[PDB]
Scaffold this active site. Sequence first.
Site, mmCIF file in Angstrom:
data_model
loop_
_atom_site.group_PDB
_atom_site.id
_atom_site.type_symbol
_atom_site.label_atom_id
_atom_site.label_comp_id
_atom_site.label_asym_id
_atom_site.label_seq_id
_atom_site.Cartn_x
_atom_site.Cartn_y
_atom_site.Cartn_z
ATOM 1 N N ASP A 37 0.864 -1.240 0.028
ATOM 2 C CA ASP A 37 -0.035 0.005 0.179
ATOM 3 C C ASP A 37 0.850 1.140 0.013
ATOM 4 O O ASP A 37 1.505 1.700 1.001
ATOM 5 C CB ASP A 37 -1.115 0.047 1.176
ATOM 6 C CG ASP A 37 -1.710 1.176 1.288
ATOM 7 O OD1 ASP A 37 -2.105 1.932 0.223
ATOM 8 O OD2 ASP A 37 -2.663 1.313 2.185
ATOM 9 N N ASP A 221 -1.915 5.376 -5.760
ATOM 10 C CA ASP A 221 -2.369 4.277 -4.595
ATOM 11 C C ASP A 221 -2.265 2.966 -5.019
ATOM 12 O O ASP A 221 -3.415 2.641 -5.511
ATOM 13 C CB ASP A 221 -3.581 4.789 -4.026
ATOM 14 C CG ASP A 221 -3.916 3.947 -2.592
ATOM 15 O OD1 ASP A 221 -3.163 3.107 -2.105
ATOM 16 O OD2 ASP A 221 -4.779 4.671 -1.847
#
Length: 371
Positions: A37, A221
Amino acid sequence: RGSFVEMVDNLRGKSGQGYYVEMTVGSPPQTLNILVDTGSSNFAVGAAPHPFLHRYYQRQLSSTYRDLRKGVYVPYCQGKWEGELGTDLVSIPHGPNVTVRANIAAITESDKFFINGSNWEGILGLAYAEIARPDDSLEPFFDSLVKQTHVPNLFSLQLCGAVGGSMIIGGIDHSLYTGSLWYTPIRREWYYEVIIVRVEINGQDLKMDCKEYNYDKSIVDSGTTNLRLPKKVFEAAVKSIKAASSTEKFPDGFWLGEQLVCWQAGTTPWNIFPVISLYLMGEVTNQSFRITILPQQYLRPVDDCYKFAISQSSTGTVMGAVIMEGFYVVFDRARKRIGFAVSACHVHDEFRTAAVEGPFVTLDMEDCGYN
Ligand SMILES: O=C(NCCCS)[C@@H]1CN(Cc2ccc(F)cc2)CCN1
């Protein structure tokens, strides 16, 4: 300087459930699959026997565990994870040959976090210290690794759709991309913030103010599945994508992502759908470049069935997996920039490809940034 053959193909996963790398924590080493992430900064692993977890981090069996005696409560999208802060030795088996002492959040309780059936048991926050919880003194995993080893401050990601990919810690692998790399500068070191200057749907300008594209912020992201766009931007995008795909008519709930659209085996009409081009700010003054994705990127497989993977966001533009699956993304942290180049593994047909092209002359690019 290339080729990094050990690190290639170290990421696994399932469609719309995130990409995970194999990691070990503590000594004796405990093996755990950890999601990559770049939208967060916290390294947090499952520590309590949750129903969805096959395995977890046991602090009592690690002879290199250290308690920091500090609690942390972190909210995610629809739920939240609550854990206890500490430190241990961490390694990546299919990564660089090094071991680091790093901060670990031992997840003791979680509400709507761990995904059922998914193979990952944790999260690896690769963003900067500012958005790290509880505060900006809890050094994120990657910052520790650079400071404790000789590993260069740089990493690249190649996510391949259908699911697997590659995370290269420390360098740029040429086997993973074609053509040339174009760099958009990081505006501020918290998320991986970038500036979108123009958006096209089949070379059709949306004619929107460029500041609207970055309303709040525009981030890269790896955690986020879909491509997320601000309320005003999402409206125009769906309108044009609906306009270009006129040949076949789709139920009104499909565009919101609630419904599933299907075709007969192989006969998927890729050409009926447009391409989306995001122009990003260059390194040189009055200079930009565009990145282009195919429907194969924004139509997510689940007869062949697909879910429209573009959704609305009240938190800004999120260039998620959908965008990333078409490119080789280099997070050049040390030089305050993010690189883009055509992915070697990206899904395409015979007649169209994902693209990265430039330079394009664009004026007043600073005005696109929001405050
Ligand atoms: O980010 C997503 N979408 C936005 C949802 C609206 S806030 C998720 C990503 N999820 C995997 C995951 C799960 C936890 C995590 F910390 C990071 C990534 C798969 C489903 N979509």
